[PDB]
Amino acid sequence: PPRKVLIISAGASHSVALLSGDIVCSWGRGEDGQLGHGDAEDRPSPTQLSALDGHQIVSVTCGADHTVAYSQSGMEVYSWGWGDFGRLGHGNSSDLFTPLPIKALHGIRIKQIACGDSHCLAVTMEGEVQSWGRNQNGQLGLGDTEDSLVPQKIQAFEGIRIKMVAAGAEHTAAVTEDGDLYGWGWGRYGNLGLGDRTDRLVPERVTSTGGEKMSMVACGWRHTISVSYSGALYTYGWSKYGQLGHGDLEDHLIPHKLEALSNSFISQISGGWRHTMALTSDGKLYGWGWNKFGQVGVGNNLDQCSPVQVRFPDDQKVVQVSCGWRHTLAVTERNNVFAWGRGTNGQLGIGESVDRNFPKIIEALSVDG
Amino acid sequence: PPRKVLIISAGASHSVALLSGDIVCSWGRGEDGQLGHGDAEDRPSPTQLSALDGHQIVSVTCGADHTVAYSQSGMEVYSWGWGDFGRLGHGNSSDLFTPLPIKALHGIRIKQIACGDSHCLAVTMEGEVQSWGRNQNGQLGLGDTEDSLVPQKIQAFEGIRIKMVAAGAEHTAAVTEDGDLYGWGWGRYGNLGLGDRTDRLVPERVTSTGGEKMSMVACGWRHTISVSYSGALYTYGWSKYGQLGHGDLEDHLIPHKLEALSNSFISQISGGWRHTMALTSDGKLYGWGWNKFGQVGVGNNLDQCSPVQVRFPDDQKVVQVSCGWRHTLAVTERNNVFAWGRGTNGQLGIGESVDRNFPKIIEALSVDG
Ligand SMILES: [Mg+2]
Ligand SMILES: [Mg+2]
C-alpha cells in the first residue's frame, strides 16, 4: 500500500509531516533546532527525522520555532527546537536540535497538544490540561505570571472535561466537551473574546457566543477562531490585516459570526500569523488576511479582508490545512500535499524556490506531480 | 579611496553600516524589512540604502528585526523593519520596508538611540529620554504595562541628566552624567542589577556598583554590562552560556566586577544574544559566551565563560565592535571591517558563505583584502 501523509503542521518558518509507517519528516528553517535533524540548517525539501524512526509517533504539532510529537504505544511526548522560557518542557531553557522525551508526560494518555510561540498545552484523554513555557501574561492559566519550565496541571479545569485547546503568540483558548468556550493570557487586541482588552491569568468563560455551543477553536498570533455545533464560524481579536474576515479591518472583543460563510459548514480551521484558513465539509478551502507573500493562495499578493476560495488542480477536495507565519500547507482527498506563500527558508518543501501565491504540489509527498 | 566606515551595528540577523559621504549600507536578513531596500530579500553583501542618500545620516542602530538612523542637520530620526508593538514609533503597527521619519521626534536634538527586541529609546542633547514600543514588562519606564506606538517622555528622569541608554530583549538600562546606573523592565534573570528577579515599571537606581560611578552601559538579550570611571568592567544578569564572563555559568543579581580584565581599561562594550564583547583602550578585543556558530571569534566552537582575545591579521587594533544574535562585527584602526559567526542570512557581508569562527574581512567595505 502506497505511502500517505497523515498529519501536516506548519510553524513560523518550518513544516512537519507524519507519513504512513510512522515516519516523521520536516523542512524549512532549521536555525533553532525546530526540524530536529541535529544540525541547524534549512531544508528546502522533506527530510526524514530518523531519530524518531521506530517510536510510533501518531501526531506532530508545530509552535513558532519548536515542534512537539507524541506516541501512544510509547506513552511518550517529545519536543525539540528553541528552548527559551521552557517551551520544550524539560525543566531547563536549553535548545534541542534532536527530539527528547518530556519526562513529566511519560505514561499519560494524550488527546491533543497545542503549541503557541513560547508556551504549550497538552489535553489528556480524561479531559485534563497541563501547560508549560512562557507565562508573563498568564497564558499558562495557572493564576500567576511566572514561566514554567515543566508541565503543570491547570487546576481551574477540575471537574470540567476539556475537548480541545489552542495557543497563539501569548494567549490560549479552549472548548469543553459540553461546548463552553474559554480564553486566557495576553488580551490586548480583544483576542480572548471577553469583551475587553485585559489579560487573564486563569481561564475565563466566553459568555457571548450567540447562544451557541462551540465544537472547536484555533488561534492565530493575535486572533482567535471558533466553530459552533451548527458549523458557523466565529472570529475575534486583531483584524489589522483583515484576518477576522468580516470584509473590513475592525477588531472584535467578543466572537463575531462570519456571515459570508453562513451557508457552509466549517469542518477545520487554522490561524496563521496574520492570515486565516477555514475548510468546509464539502472540501472547499477558504483563506483570508495578510497576503504579502502569497500565503492566502488566491493567485495574487493583495490582502483579503473577506474569505476567498483557494483553488486546486481539477477542483480536488481539501481535507487538511495548516497555517504558518508566512506560508500555508494543505492535504487533499487524492493524498496530494500542497504548499504556498513564502519559500525563502525552504518551508514550501518544493526544493529551491521563489515564493508562490497559489497552491504548489509537493512532489516528495504526493501521488501526483 | 574606499569610504571610511564610521559606524557599524548588528541586529539579530542583519548588519548596517554608515560610511563617509553619509551613505548607509545594510546586509543580512531582509524578511521583515530591516534592510530598507523596499523588497524583502536577504542580502549577502553590503547594499547601499538608496532611500537615505543625501539625508545626512550621522548614526545607525539595529534592534533585533528593525533599524533606526538619525540625521543631526536634518533633525530627523528614521526607522524601518518589523512594526509590531510600535517599535518603529509611527503611531501604528505597520512594518516598513523603506525608512520613514518618526514625526514625533522631528526637530529634536538627538544624543543617542538604543534599540532592543521590541522597544527603543532616544536620549536628547539636554539629557531627557523618550521611549516607545512594547511595554508588557515595564521596559518603557513609563510606569505601566501598556505598549506605546509613539515616543513618550520618561518623566522619572526629570532633573536627572542621562548620558546613555541601552536595551535588551525586554529590559532597559541607563547611566547618568553623574555616574548613576539604572535598570527597568523584565527582571527575571537578575539583569536589572537590583538584587532580585522582579520587574520594574519605572527606572530604579542600582545601588551596588562596587563603590564606583559608571560611564557606559550595554545590554545583551538578558544580561547587562557596565564600565566604571576607572575602566573596570561589570556584568550582571543571565549566565546560562557564560555571557557574564566570570569563569562559571552563574547568574548575578547585582553588578559583578569581571576580575580577569582588571588590568585593562575598557573603552567599548557590546552585548549579544548569548555572547559579549569588550574592547580595551589599547585596541584589544575580548569576546566570551555562546560560541555554537563561532560568534566569539576565537577560531573554534567551544563556549567561553571567560574573556578570550579575538585576533586579527597583523595584530591590527580594533576601534569598534557590535554583537548580533549569532554574529559579531568589528572595525579596525586600518579601516577594515570584519565579521564572524553565523552567515546563513548573509549577515557576514562576504557573499554567500558558510559560518565562520574567526574574523573574516568584508572586502566591499575594507581598505585591505
Ligand atoms: Mg535565499
Ligand atoms: Mg542557505
From Swiss-Prot, chains A, B:
Q: What GO biological process terms does the UniProt entry carry, in alphabetical order?
A: entrainment of circadian clock; response to UV; response to UV-B
The observed outcome of changing W325A is:
Reduces response to UV-B
The consequence of W221A is: Reduces response to UV-B
Q: From the record, what ranges are coiled-coil?
A: none
Q: What is its main location?
A: nucleus
Q: Name one GO cellular component term.
A: cytosol
Effect upon mutating W27A: Loss of function, homodimerization and interaction with COP1
RCC1 repeat ranges per the UniProt record: 1-19, 20-72, 74-125, 127-177, 178-229, 231-281, 282-333, 335-369
Q: Which GO terms describe its molecular function?
A: chromatin binding; guanyl-nucleotide exchange factor activity; identical protein binding; photoreceptor activity; protein homodimerization activity
The alphabetized UniProt keywords are:
Acetylation, Chromophore, Cytoplasm, Nucleus, Photoreceptor protein, Receptor, Repeat, Sensory transduction
Repressor as a keyword of this entry, yes or no, is no
Impact reported for G271E: In uvr8-5; loss of response to UV-B
Q: What are the subcellular locations of this protein?
A: Nucleus; Cytoplasm, Cytosol
Q: What is the deletion mutant like?
A: Hypersensitivity to ultraviolet-B (UV-B) illumination. Abrogated induction of DHU1 in response to UV-B. Disruption in a plant lacking DHU1 alleviates its hypersensitivity to UV-B.
**What does the function comment of this entry state?**
UV-B specific signaling component that acts as a UV-B photoreceptor and plays a key role in establishing UV-protective responses in plants. Upon UV-B irradiation, UVR8 undergoes an immediate switch from homodimer to monomer, accumulates in the nucleus, interacts with the photomorphogenic repressor COP1 and regulates the expression of the transcription factor HY5 by associating with chromatin (through histone H2B binding) in the HY5 promoter region.
Give the multimer and partner information.
Answer: Homodimer in the absence of UV-B, but absorption of UV-B induces monomerization of UVR8 and interaction with COP1. Interacts with RUP1, RUP2 and histone H2B.
**Which protein, by its recorded name, is this?**
Ultraviolet-B receptor UVR8
Task: Kindly list the organism's lineage.
Answer: Eukaryota, Viridiplantae, Streptophyta, Embryophyta, Tracheophyta
What would be the name of the gene that encodes this protein? UVR8
